[PDB]
Amino acid sequence: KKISGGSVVEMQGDEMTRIIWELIKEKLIFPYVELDLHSYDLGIENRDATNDQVTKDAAEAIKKHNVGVKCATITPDEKRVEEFKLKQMWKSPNGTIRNILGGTVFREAIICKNIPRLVSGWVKPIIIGHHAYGDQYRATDFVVPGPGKVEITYTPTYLHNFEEGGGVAMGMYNQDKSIEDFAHSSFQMALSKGWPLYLSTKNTILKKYDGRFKDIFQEIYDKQYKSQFEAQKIWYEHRLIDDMVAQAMKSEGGFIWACKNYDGDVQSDSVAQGYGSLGMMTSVLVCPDGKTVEAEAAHGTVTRHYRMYQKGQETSTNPIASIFAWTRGLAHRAKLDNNKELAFFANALEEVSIETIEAGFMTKDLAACIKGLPNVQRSDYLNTFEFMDKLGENLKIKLAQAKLSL
Amino acid sequence: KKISGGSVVEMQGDEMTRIIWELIKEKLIFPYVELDLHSYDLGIENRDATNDQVTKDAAEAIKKHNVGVKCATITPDEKRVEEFKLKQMWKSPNGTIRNILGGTVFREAIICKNIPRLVSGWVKPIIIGHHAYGDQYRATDFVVPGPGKVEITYTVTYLVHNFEEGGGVAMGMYNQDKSIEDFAHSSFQMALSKGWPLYLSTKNTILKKYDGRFKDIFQEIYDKQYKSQFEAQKIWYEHRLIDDMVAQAMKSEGGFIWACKNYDGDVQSDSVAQGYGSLGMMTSVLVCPDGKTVEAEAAHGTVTRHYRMYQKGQETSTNPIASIFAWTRGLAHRAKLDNNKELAFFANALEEVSIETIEAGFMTKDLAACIKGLPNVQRSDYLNTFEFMDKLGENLKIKLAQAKLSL
Ligand SMILES: NC(=O)c1ccc[n+]([C@@H]2O[C@H](COP(=O)([O-])OP(=O)(O)OC[C@H]3O[C@@H](n4cnc5c(N)ncnc54)[C@H](OP(=O)(O)O)[C@@H]3O)[C@@H](O)[C@H]2O)c1
Ligand SMILES: NC(=O)c1ccc[n+]([C@@H]2O[C@H](COP(=O)([O-])OP(=O)(O)OC[C@H]3O[C@@H](n4cnc5c(N)ncnc54)[C@H](OP(=O)(O)O)[C@@H]3O)[C@@H](O)[C@H]2O)c1
Ligand SMILES: CC(C)c1ccc(Nc2nc3cc(C(=O)O)ccc3n2[C@H]2C[C@@H](C)CC(C)(C)C2)cc1
C-alpha cells in the first residue's frame, strides 16, 4: 500500500527543471505516495496558449487546497518572445502567484557537511525573506524627455525642477496591508522553524517609509506573537543592515532574516550564494494565515544544461532544490492533515538526499565546490540520471529499513 | 631638506579620528613633506559656529586646488543636536562636499596577508563605487494618512496608486542625465587611474526604463571617450547583472571596480568593510568627472566609543590605516598632477610601511581580533593607538633612510 498524501497543487515548468521534475515524481514520490493531485502546466507554451490564465488558475487552486509545489519556469524577455513567437512578454508566474496569494518568499539553503560555505561556521541556514511587489506595493517610472517640473501630489504637493536637459523619474507606494502581510508571514515562518526573526533596514534616508515597517512589525509582534515566541524560547528584533551582516558572519546560522529594501539586496542576496551551489537553494512562499504555502526551487530552468540534453549530451544537474520543494510541500501538507506517515516520508527523503551527498555521491556543481572546477574529473561526480537513480535506490533502502522496525 | 609637496586642502574632523589625524600629520607627514596647506576645520563645533559655511568653503577650495584629504566627521542626528546644543541638524559634510564637487565615492580596502577576508582568494581589493544623491538626484517620501489618490505629474500624468482602503506610505525620486553622466565619467576615470576593469551592476528587474538609461549612458560615454584608452591598458567596461556580479566576486582574486547602482543614496555602508576584516582598513576616494580632482577620506566614522575611553583617560586601540591611506592616496594624486617623483615615492613608501608593520605582527586590537577572535585576544597581541603610531613612525624613518642609502 502507498501513503495517502492528500490534496496537492503541482505546477509543471520548463527546460531542464521540467525533465528533473518528472524524474522526481516517477522515482521519489509516486512509488511511495498516492496524491489527490491538481496539476497545472505552467510551461511557457501552455501559458502563451492560455493567455497566462493557467498561472491564475494555479494560484487560485493553491489558495483553495493550501499546498503548492512548483517547477522552475521561464520568465520571458525579448529573446524568449522571438524564440517561442510569444503573443506578449508575459509576467513572471512567480510574481503572479505571490501577488494572488499575498505571501512572502523565503529562501533556505540545504547544508551538507562536506560542501563548503562562505563562512565555515554556518551549520544551519540563514533563511532570507523578501518584500516584493504586489497589488498594494508597486512602482512606475518614466523618461522625462526634457525641461519641466516633476511633482508628486496627494488628493483627498511634493516637488525636482528640471531646467536643463532630460532625465528619469519614478514613484512608489506601499499600503499598510502589504506590510502587515509581510510581518504576519515572517512571524508565521519563525514559529514554523522555531528560530528567531530579524527585520533589517538601513540608514533612514526615507525615514517615514522605513519607520512604518519597524512600527507595524513591532505592533503585530507585541499583540499577536510575543506570547508564542517566548513559549518556544525565540524572539523578534529589528536590526540595522550592517549589524545584520556582522551577526551573520559570526554565527552558526539558524535565524530568519526579513530583508527590507526597494526590491532587492546586495548582501542578503550575497548570503544566498554563499552555500556553494544554486542547486541547493529552495524558496517557500508563506501566506499571512500560516496555512497556505507554495514550495519551489530558488534557481532557474538551467537552460544551458537543457541545450546539452537536447543535443543528447550528458548533463549533471543538481535536483536537490527541486526535491526539497516536494519535501517541504509534503511536510506542510502533513502538518495540516495531521498525517504521521507523510511527515515521516518527507523527512526521510530529505535525510536520504543529504546522506547521499555526504557519502560522496553528487552532481558536478557540488564536486566543484569541494575541489574547484578546474580539478574536477569525471570520476568525481554523477550525471543527472545516475544521481537520481542513486537517490531512488537509497530512498527505497531507507523506507524498507523503516518498515522492518515493526 | 623636506619634499616639496605642493597644494593640498586638509579638513579636520571629530572625536577619535581627529586625535589620530594630528598624530598622522605630526609623525608621518610633516617631518618629511612641506605642504602648501589649506586647512579647514570641519569639526562639529566649528561647523555649528560657521552655520556649516566652513564645509562649503572647504569644498570650493578642493575644486580650486584639486586635492583634498579629510578626517572623519560627525553627521548630526537628534541625539547629536541635544549633545552639542546644535543650531540645526546640519547636513553631512561628505554629502555637501560630494554635491558641490559632483563626484563619485569609491571605497577600497587595504589588504594585509595575515588578515583574513571573507573570501580567502582575494589578494587585491574590489573597489565599490556608489551613485549618491545630489543636486540632480533626490527623493522625498511621505505618510499617506488615508483613502485617496497618489499621482506623479510632469509639465503628462502617471498614477502611482488609487488608495481605496486604509493608509500607507509613498515616495518619489528623480535623476537627471547629467548626474548619470558624471557617475559614468567618474567611474571610467577611476578605472583608468587604477588600470583595472570596470563593471556597472544593475538588477534589470523592476524599474526597466530607469535602469536602461544608466546602461545606455554608460555605453555611449564608453564607446565615444574611453574604449580607446581602455584597450590601451588591456582593460574593459562591461554591464553586468547583480547576481552575476556577486558570483564573480566570490570566485575572483579581486582587482576590479564595481560601480553599484541601487535605489539608495550613499549609505554609511560599514557592510563592505567586513568583507576585509575591519572598518579601520577601508578608505573612500571621491573622484570627479574631470579626472583631475579627488578627495580622500577614511570610510569609517569618528569611532565615538574609543573617543569616550580617551576622554576618561583609558587606553584605546584605534586603527589609523584608513586615515593614513587618505593622506597617501591624496598625496599620490597630488604627485601625479604635479609630476613629482619624490612625493609619489614617499606616498607609496608610507603605504608599504603600513602594510609591512601589520604583516610583521604589530597591529591594533581590531586586527588582532580578525586573526584570533575577540574572546582570545590578550593585551600582548596588540598595540594601543599611540604605540602603533610610534611603531609606524619608527618604520617610516627606517624605510626613507634605506631609500637614501641605496641606488
Ligand atoms: N524558479 C523560477 O521560476 C525562476 C526564477 C528565476 C529565473 N528563472 C528563469 O530560468 C531561466 C534560466 O535562467 P538562468 O540560466 O539565467 O539561471 P539558471 O537557470 O539558475 O542557471 C544558470 C546557471 O547556474 C547553474 N545552475 C543553476 N541551477 C543548477 C542546478 N540545479 N544544477 C547545476 N547547476 C545549476 C548552472 O551553471 P553552469 O552553467 O556553470 O553549469 C546554470 O547554467 C530564465 O528564463 C529565467 O528567467 C526562473
Ligand atoms: N568618515 C566620516 O566623515 C563619517 C561618515 C559617516 C558617519 N560618520 C560618523 O561617525 C560617527 C560614529 O559612527 P558609528 O557610531 O557608526 O561608529 P564608527 O566610527 O563606524 O565605529 C563603530 C565601531 O566600529 C569599530 N571601528 C570603526 N573604525 C575603527 C578604527 N579606525 N579602529 C578600530 N575600530 C574601529 C569600533 O568597534 P568596537 O566598538 O568593537 O571597538 C567602533 O566602536 C557618527 O557620528 C557618524 O555620523 C563619519
Ligand atoms: C553576510 C555575508 C554574505 C556578507 C559580508 C559582507 C558584505 N559586504 C558587502 N556589503 C555590500 C554593500 C554593497 C552596496 O550597498 O552596494 C555592495 C557590496 C557589499 N558587500 C560585499 C559583498 C561581497 C560578496 C563582495 C564585496 C566586494 C566584499 C562586497 C555582504 C555580505
Short mmCIF file of N, CA, C and O in Angstrom, two decimals, chain A residues 50-141:
data_model
loop_
_atom_site.label_atom_id
_atom_site.label_comp_id
_atom_site.label_asym_id
_atom_site.label_seq_id
_atom_site.Cartn_x
_atom_site.Cartn_y
_atom_site.Cartn_z
N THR A 50 -2.87 29.87 -23.17
CA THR A 50 -3.98 30.22 -22.28
C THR A 50 -4.02 31.71 -21.94
O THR A 50 -4.85 32.13 -21.14
N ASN A 51 -3.14 32.52 -22.53
CA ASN A 51 -3.06 33.94 -22.19
C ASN A 51 -2.67 34.18 -20.73
O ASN A 51 -3.13 35.14 -20.10
N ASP A 52 -1.82 33.29 -20.24
CA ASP A 52 -1.35 33.25 -18.86
C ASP A 52 -2.46 32.93 -17.84
O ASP A 52 -2.24 33.06 -16.64
N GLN A 53 -3.61 32.45 -18.30
CA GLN A 53 -4.73 32.13 -17.42
C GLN A 53 -4.40 30.93 -16.53
O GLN A 53 -4.84 30.89 -15.38
N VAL A 54 -3.67 29.96 -17.06
CA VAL A 54 -3.26 28.78 -16.29
C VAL A 54 -2.50 29.15 -14.99
O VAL A 54 -2.65 28.47 -13.98
N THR A 55 -1.70 30.22 -15.04
CA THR A 55 -0.99 30.70 -13.87
C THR A 55 -1.96 31.20 -12.80
O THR A 55 -1.80 30.91 -11.61
N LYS A 56 -2.98 31.93 -13.24
CA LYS A 56 -4.01 32.42 -12.35
C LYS A 56 -4.82 31.26 -11.78
O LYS A 56 -5.04 31.21 -10.58
N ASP A 57 -5.22 30.31 -12.64
CA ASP A 57 -5.96 29.13 -12.19
C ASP A 57 -5.17 28.35 -11.13
O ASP A 57 -5.73 27.89 -10.13
N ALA A 58 -3.86 28.21 -11.36
CA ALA A 58 -2.97 27.53 -10.41
C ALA A 58 -2.93 28.23 -9.06
O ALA A 58 -3.06 27.59 -8.03
N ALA A 59 -2.76 29.54 -9.08
CA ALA A 59 -2.74 30.33 -7.84
C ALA A 59 -4.05 30.18 -7.06
O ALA A 59 -4.02 29.95 -5.86
N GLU A 60 -5.18 30.27 -7.75
CA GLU A 60 -6.49 30.08 -7.11
C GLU A 60 -6.62 28.66 -6.52
O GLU A 60 -7.18 28.50 -5.45
N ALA A 61 -6.09 27.65 -7.20
CA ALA A 61 -6.09 26.29 -6.67
C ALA A 61 -5.27 26.16 -5.37
O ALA A 61 -5.67 25.43 -4.47
N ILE A 62 -4.13 26.85 -5.29
CA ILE A 62 -3.29 26.84 -4.09
C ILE A 62 -4.02 27.49 -2.92
O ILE A 62 -3.98 26.99 -1.80
N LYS A 63 -4.68 28.61 -3.21
CA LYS A 63 -5.49 29.34 -2.22
C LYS A 63 -6.55 28.42 -1.63
O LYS A 63 -6.88 28.52 -0.46
N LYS A 64 -7.07 27.53 -2.46
CA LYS A 64 -8.11 26.59 -2.10
C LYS A 64 -7.61 25.33 -1.37
O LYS A 64 -8.23 24.92 -0.39
N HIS A 65 -6.53 24.73 -1.85
CA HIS A 65 -6.02 23.47 -1.28
C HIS A 65 -4.86 23.62 -0.29
O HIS A 65 -4.45 22.64 0.32
N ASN A 66 -4.31 24.83 -0.15
CA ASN A 66 -3.25 25.17 0.84
C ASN A 66 -1.82 24.74 0.54
O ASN A 66 -0.91 25.18 1.25
N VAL A 67 -1.60 23.86 -0.44
CA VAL A 67 -0.25 23.34 -0.70
C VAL A 67 0.03 23.33 -2.19
O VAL A 67 -0.67 22.68 -2.96
N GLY A 68 1.07 24.06 -2.57
CA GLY A 68 1.56 24.10 -3.94
C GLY A 68 3.01 23.64 -4.00
O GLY A 68 3.80 23.98 -3.12
N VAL A 69 3.34 22.87 -5.02
CA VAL A 69 4.71 22.58 -5.35
C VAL A 69 4.89 22.93 -6.81
O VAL A 69 4.19 22.42 -7.66
N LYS A 70 5.88 23.77 -7.11
CA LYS A 70 6.08 24.30 -8.46
C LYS A 70 7.51 24.08 -8.98
O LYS A 70 8.50 24.25 -8.27
N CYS A 71 7.58 23.70 -10.25
CA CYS A 71 8.81 23.57 -11.01
C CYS A 71 9.24 24.93 -11.54
O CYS A 71 8.40 25.80 -11.74
N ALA A 72 10.53 25.13 -11.80
CA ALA A 72 11.01 26.42 -12.31
C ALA A 72 10.46 26.70 -13.70
O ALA A 72 10.28 25.78 -14.48
N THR A 73 10.19 27.96 -13.98
CA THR A 73 9.54 28.39 -15.21
C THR A 73 10.36 29.47 -15.90
O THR A 73 11.15 30.13 -15.27
N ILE A 74 10.19 29.61 -17.21
CA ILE A 74 10.82 30.68 -17.98
C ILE A 74 10.11 31.99 -17.68
O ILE A 74 8.88 32.05 -17.74
N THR A 75 10.88 33.03 -17.36
CA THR A 75 10.36 34.40 -17.32
C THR A 75 10.73 35.04 -18.66
O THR A 75 11.90 35.26 -18.94
N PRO A 76 9.73 35.34 -19.49
CA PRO A 76 10.05 35.85 -20.82
C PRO A 76 10.74 37.21 -20.84
O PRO A 76 10.37 38.11 -20.08
N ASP A 77 11.74 37.34 -21.71
CA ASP A 77 12.32 38.61 -22.15
C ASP A 77 12.18 38.70 -23.68
O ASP A 77 11.53 37.84 -24.28
N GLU A 78 12.79 39.70 -24.32
CA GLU A 78 12.69 39.84 -25.79
C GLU A 78 13.15 38.60 -26.56
O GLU A 78 12.45 38.15 -27.45
N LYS A 79 14.30 38.05 -26.19
CA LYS A 79 14.81 36.83 -26.83
C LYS A 79 13.85 35.65 -26.72
O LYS A 79 13.70 34.91 -27.68
N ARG A 80 13.21 35.48 -25.56
CA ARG A 80 12.19 34.42 -25.38
C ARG A 80 10.93 34.66 -26.22
O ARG A 80 10.35 33.70 -26.72
N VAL A 81 10.52 35.92 -26.37
CA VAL A 81 9.43 36.26 -27.27
C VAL A 81 9.79 35.83 -28.69
O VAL A 81 8.96 35.21 -29.33
N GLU A 82 11.02 36.09 -29.16
CA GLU A 82 11.40 35.69 -30.53
C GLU A 82 11.52 34.17 -30.65
O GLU A 82 11.15 33.60 -31.67
N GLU A 83 12.05 33.52 -29.60
CA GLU A 83 12.27 32.05 -29.58
C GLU A 83 10.97 31.26 -29.72
O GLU A 83 10.90 30.33 -30.52
N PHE A 84 9.96 31.62 -28.92
CA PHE A 84 8.69 30.91 -28.92
C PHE A 84 7.58 31.64 -29.71
O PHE A 84 6.43 31.18 -29.73
N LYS A 85 7.92 32.76 -30.36
CA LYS A 85 6.96 33.65 -31.03
C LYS A 85 5.75 33.90 -30.12
O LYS A 85 4.61 33.64 -30.48
N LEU A 86 6.05 34.36 -28.90
CA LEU A 86 5.04 34.62 -27.88
C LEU A 86 4.13 35.77 -28.29
O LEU A 86 4.51 36.63 -29.09
N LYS A 87 2.92 35.77 -27.73
CA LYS A 87 1.91 36.80 -28.03
C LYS A 87 2.19 38.08 -27.26
O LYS A 87 2.07 39.16 -27.81
N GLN A 88 2.57 37.94 -25.99
CA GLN A 88 3.08 39.05 -25.18
C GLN A 88 4.27 38.59 -24.34
O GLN A 88 4.49 37.39 -24.14
N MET A 89 5.01 39.57 -23.83
CA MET A 89 6.05 39.32 -22.86
C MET A 89 5.40 39.12 -21.50
O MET A 89 5.29 40.04 -20.68
N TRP A 90 4.96 37.88 -21.28
CA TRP A 90 4.15 37.53 -20.11
C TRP A 90 4.92 37.79 -18.82
O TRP A 90 6.15 37.74 -18.79
N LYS A 91 4.18 38.10 -17.77
CA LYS A 91 4.75 38.43 -16.46
C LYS A 91 5.26 37.13 -15.84
O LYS A 91 4.78 36.05 -16.16
N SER A 92 6.26 37.24 -14.97
CA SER A 92 6.75 36.09 -14.22
C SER A 92 5.61 35.36 -13.50
O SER A 92 4.88 35.98 -12.73
N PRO A 93 5.45 34.04 -13.72
CA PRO A 93 4.38 33.36 -12.98
C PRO A 93 4.55 33.37 -11.46
O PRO A 93 3.56 33.33 -10.72
N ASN A 94 5.80 33.42 -11.00
CA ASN A 94 6.09 33.56 -9.57
C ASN A 94 5.48 34.82 -9.00
O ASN A 94 4.87 34.79 -7.93
N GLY A 95 5.66 35.93 -9.73
CA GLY A 95 5.06 37.21 -9.35
C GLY A 95 3.55 37.15 -9.29
O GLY A 95 2.94 37.57 -8.31
N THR A 96 2.95 36.60 -10.33
CA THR A 96 1.51 36.47 -10.41
C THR A 96 0.95 35.60 -9.28
O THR A 96 -0.11 35.91 -8.73
N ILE A 97 1.64 34.51 -8.93
CA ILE A 97 1.16 33.62 -7.87
C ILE A 97 1.31 34.28 -6.49
O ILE A 97 0.37 34.30 -5.69
N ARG A 98 2.50 34.82 -6.24
CA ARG A 98 2.80 35.54 -5.00
C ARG A 98 1.84 36.71 -4.76
O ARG A 98 1.38 36.92 -3.63
N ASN A 99 1.51 37.41 -5.84
CA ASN A 99 0.54 38.51 -5.80
C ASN A 99 -0.87 38.05 -5.40
O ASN A 99 -1.47 38.59 -4.47
N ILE A 100 -1.39 37.04 -6.10
CA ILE A 100 -2.70 36.49 -5.80
C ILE A 100 -2.78 35.91 -4.38
O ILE A 100 -3.80 36.05 -3.72
N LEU A 101 -1.71 35.26 -3.92
CA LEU A 101 -1.71 34.60 -2.60
C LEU A 101 -1.35 35.53 -1.46
O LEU A 101 -1.69 35.26 -0.30
N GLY A 102 -0.65 36.61 -1.78
CA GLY A 102 -0.29 37.64 -0.80
C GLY A 102 0.86 37.28 0.13
O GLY A 102 1.06 37.94 1.15
N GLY A 103 1.63 36.26 -0.23
CA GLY A 103 2.65 35.77 0.67
C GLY A 103 4.00 36.48 0.58
O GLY A 103 4.19 37.43 -0.19
N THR A 104 4.92 35.97 1.39
CA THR A 104 6.32 36.34 1.37
C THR A 104 7.16 35.10 1.05
O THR A 104 6.94 34.03 1.62
N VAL A 105 8.13 35.26 0.14
CA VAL A 105 9.01 34.17 -0.29
C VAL A 105 10.25 34.13 0.59
O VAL A 105 10.91 35.14 0.74
N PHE A 106 10.56 32.95 1.12
CA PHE A 106 11.72 32.72 1.98
C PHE A 106 12.67 31.70 1.36
O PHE A 106 12.27 30.57 1.08
N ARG A 107 13.92 32.12 1.14
CA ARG A 107 14.95 31.24 0.57
C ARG A 107 15.77 30.57 1.65
O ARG A 107 16.23 31.23 2.57
N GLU A 108 15.95 29.26 1.53
CA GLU A 108 16.67 28.47 2.52
C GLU A 108 17.59 27.52 1.80
O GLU A 108 17.15 26.76 0.96
N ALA A 109 18.88 27.55 2.15
CA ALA A 109 19.84 26.55 1.67
C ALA A 109 19.66 25.16 2.30
O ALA A 109 19.12 25.03 3.41
N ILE A 110 20.09 24.14 1.56
CA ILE A 110 20.28 22.79 2.10
C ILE A 110 21.78 22.63 2.38
O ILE A 110 22.59 22.73 1.44
N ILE A 111 22.14 22.40 3.65
CA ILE A 111 23.54 22.26 4.07
C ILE A 111 23.92 20.78 4.10
O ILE A 111 23.25 19.97 4.73
N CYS A 112 25.01 20.44 3.43
CA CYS A 112 25.67 19.15 3.57
C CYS A 112 27.04 19.39 4.19
O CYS A 112 27.75 20.34 3.82
N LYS A 113 27.43 18.52 5.13
CA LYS A 113 28.66 18.69 5.91
C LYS A 113 29.95 18.75 5.08
O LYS A 113 30.90 19.44 5.46
N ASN A 114 29.98 18.06 3.94
CA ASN A 114 31.15 18.05 3.06
C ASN A 114 31.19 19.14 1.99
O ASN A 114 32.13 19.21 1.22
N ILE A 115 30.18 20.01 1.96
CA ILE A 115 30.14 21.11 0.99
C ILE A 115 30.53 22.42 1.69
O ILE A 115 29.88 22.82 2.66
N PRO A 116 31.60 23.09 1.21
CA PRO A 116 31.99 24.40 1.76
C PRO A 116 30.91 25.48 1.64
O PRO A 116 30.17 25.51 0.65
N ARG A 117 30.83 26.33 2.66
CA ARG A 117 30.03 27.55 2.61
C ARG A 117 30.97 28.74 2.63
O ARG A 117 32.18 28.59 2.83
N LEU A 118 30.39 29.92 2.44
CA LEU A 118 31.11 31.18 2.51
C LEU A 118 31.82 31.32 3.85
O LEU A 118 33.00 31.61 3.90
N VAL A 119 31.06 31.09 4.92
CA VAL A 119 31.52 31.12 6.29
C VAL A 119 31.45 29.69 6.81
O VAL A 119 30.37 29.09 6.84
N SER A 120 32.60 29.13 7.21
CA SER A 120 32.68 27.72 7.59
C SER A 120 31.92 27.38 8.88
O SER A 120 31.48 26.24 9.05
N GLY A 121 31.78 28.36 9.77
CA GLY A 121 30.97 28.22 10.98
C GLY A 121 29.48 27.94 10.79
O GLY A 121 28.84 27.42 11.71
N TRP A 122 28.92 28.28 9.64
CA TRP A 122 27.50 28.04 9.40
C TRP A 122 27.21 26.54 9.41
O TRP A 122 27.72 25.81 8.57
N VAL A 123 26.43 26.09 10.38
CA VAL A 123 25.93 24.70 10.42
C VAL A 123 24.43 24.62 10.12
O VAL A 123 23.97 23.60 9.61
N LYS A 124 23.69 25.69 10.43
CA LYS A 124 22.29 25.84 10.00
C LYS A 124 22.17 26.97 8.98
O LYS A 124 23.02 27.86 8.93
N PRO A 125 21.12 26.94 8.16
CA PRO A 125 20.95 28.01 7.19
C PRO A 125 20.43 29.30 7.82
O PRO A 125 19.82 29.28 8.89
N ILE A 126 20.68 30.41 7.13
CA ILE A 126 20.06 31.68 7.41
C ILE A 126 18.97 31.85 6.35
O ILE A 126 19.26 31.98 5.16
N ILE A 127 17.71 31.86 6.79
CA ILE A 127 16.58 31.96 5.88
C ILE A 127 16.33 33.43 5.59
O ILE A 127 16.19 34.22 6.52
N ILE A 128 16.27 33.80 4.31
CA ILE A 128 16.11 35.20 3.91
C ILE A 128 14.77 35.43 3.22
O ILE A 128 14.49 34.84 2.18
N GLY A 129 13.97 36.32 3.81
CA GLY A 129 12.66 36.69 3.30
C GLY A 129 12.70 38.04 2.62
O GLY A 129 13.39 38.93 3.07
N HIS A 130 11.92 38.19 1.55
CA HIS A 130 11.88 39.43 0.78
C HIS A 130 10.50 40.07 0.76
O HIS A 130 9.51 39.36 0.64
N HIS A 131 10.46 41.40 0.79
CA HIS A 131 9.23 42.12 0.49
C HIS A 131 9.17 42.53 -0.98
O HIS A 131 9.84 43.47 -1.41
N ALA A 132 8.34 41.82 -1.75
CA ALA A 132 8.24 42.02 -3.20
C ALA A 132 6.97 42.79 -3.59
O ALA A 132 6.04 42.93 -2.79
N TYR A 133 6.96 43.26 -4.84
CA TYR A 133 5.81 43.97 -5.39
C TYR A 133 4.55 43.12 -5.46
O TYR A 133 4.62 41.89 -5.54
N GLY A 134 3.41 43.80 -5.45
CA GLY A 134 2.10 43.17 -5.50
C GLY A 134 0.99 44.14 -5.85
O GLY A 134 1.24 45.21 -6.41
N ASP A 135 -0.24 43.77 -5.50
CA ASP A 135 -1.41 44.65 -5.72
C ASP A 135 -1.35 45.93 -4.89
O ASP A 135 -1.89 46.95 -5.30
N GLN A 136 -0.68 45.88 -3.73
CA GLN A 136 -0.62 47.02 -2.80
C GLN A 136 0.80 47.57 -2.57
O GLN A 136 1.03 48.33 -1.62
N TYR A 137 1.73 47.23 -3.47
CA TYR A 137 3.11 47.71 -3.43
C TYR A 137 3.67 47.66 -4.85
O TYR A 137 4.00 46.59 -5.35
N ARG A 138 3.77 48.83 -5.50
CA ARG A 138 4.11 48.88 -6.94
C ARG A 138 4.77 50.22 -7.28
O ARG A 138 4.64 51.19 -6.53
N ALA A 139 5.51 50.24 -8.39
CA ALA A 139 6.22 51.44 -8.82
C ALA A 139 6.13 51.63 -10.33
O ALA A 139 6.25 50.67 -11.09
N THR A 140 5.89 52.87 -10.74
CA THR A 140 6.03 53.29 -12.13
C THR A 140 7.23 54.22 -12.23
O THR A 140 7.54 54.94 -11.28
N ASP A 141 7.91 54.15 -13.37
CA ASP A 141 8.98 55.09 -13.72
C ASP A 141 8.75 55.55 -15.15
O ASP A 141 8.04 54.90 -15.90
#
